[PDB]
Design brief:
- This protein is mainly β and 102 residues long.
- The chain has a single domain, classed as Gamma-B Crystallin, domain 1, CATH 2.60.20.30.
- Helices cover 4% and strands 18% of the residues.
- Strands 1-5-3 form a three-stranded antiparallel β-sheet. Strands 2-4 form a two-stranded antiparallel sheet.
- The radius of gyration is 12 Å and the shape is globular.
- 36% of the residues are buried.
- The PDB classes it as metalloproteinase inhibitor.
């Protein structure tokens, strides 16, 4: 659910950048890279303070080697917040290679 505000990748577990609210101004994501895994949304979305290269698809890869699984096979990325590189990012049971500068 696109409930986050806008400015940095503010991830959160409570719709509205609330609950487990965290912030990634294209930087902590450079520690993860492309968040190459399954990026949910129900109580886990964020604000797109960048073009968070969102490479996603239906998540279907739970058999990972030790966590570093892209939980998918790429169905079409939406770089700039899927339209504008500055807004509340969604998902929902979708995997996503979130990249914020990597």
């Amino acid at each position: 659910a696109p409930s986050c505000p806008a400015g940095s990748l503010c991830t959160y577990s409570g719709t509205g950048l609330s609950g487990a609210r965290t912030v990634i101004p294209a930087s902590d994501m450079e520690k993860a890279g492309t968040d190459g895994v399954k990026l949910p949304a129900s109580a886990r979305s964020f604000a797109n303070g960048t073009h968070f290269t969102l490479r996603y698809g239906p998540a279907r890869k739970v058999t990972c080697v030790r966590f570093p699984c892209y939980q998918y096979a790429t169905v079409g990325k939406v770089a700039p917040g899927a339209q504008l590189r500055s807004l509340p990012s969604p998902g929902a049971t979708v995997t996503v290679g979130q990249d914020l500068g990597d």
